[PDB]
């Protein structure tokens, strides 16, 4: 007497290609899929422009010192983050 639905699986790449084709193409270039002759796809490689990372540990876990080296790293990340937000805002501010 289980209410849990049956689980039929599929490879991660298989699901991604149907949900977001752009991400799938980017992953192939990063994961070095164009170096081996046997596994080389026919489609030409796509250039990588933007990536996303998580900086929670680098900001609040990893750099506790008061030296200029640790302060500079945190400030640069904060400054870059604000620039990204401002670019998004400018795209919407105009009437």
């Amino acid at each position: 007497t289980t209410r849990r639905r049956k689980l039929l699986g599929s490879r991660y790449g298989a699901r991604l290609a149907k949900k977001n084709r752009q991400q799938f193409e980017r992953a192939r270039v990063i994961l070095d899929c164009y170096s081996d002759e046997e596994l080389r796809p026919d489609s030409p490689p796509v250039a990588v422009k933007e990536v996303t990372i998580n900086t929670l540990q680098t900001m609040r876990f990893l750099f506790p010192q008061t030296s200029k080296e640790h302060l500079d790293i945190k400030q640069n990340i904060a400054s870059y983050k604000i620039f990204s937000l401002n670019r998004e805002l400018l795209s919407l501010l105009p009437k």
């Binding site: 991660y12 991604l16 977001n20 991400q23 992953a27 990063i30 994961l31 990588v48 422009k49 933007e50 990536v51 996303t52 990372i53 998580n54 900086t55 929670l56 900001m59 990340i77 870059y80 983050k81 990204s84």
Partner: peptide
Amino acid sequence: EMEAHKIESGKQLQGPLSPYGLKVRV
């Protein structure tokens, strides 16, 4: 790469922790 897709899709770093998801131009 798998983690980045989750962040872009909006499954991780939501709410108060949103500011820690960084998009970087190469």
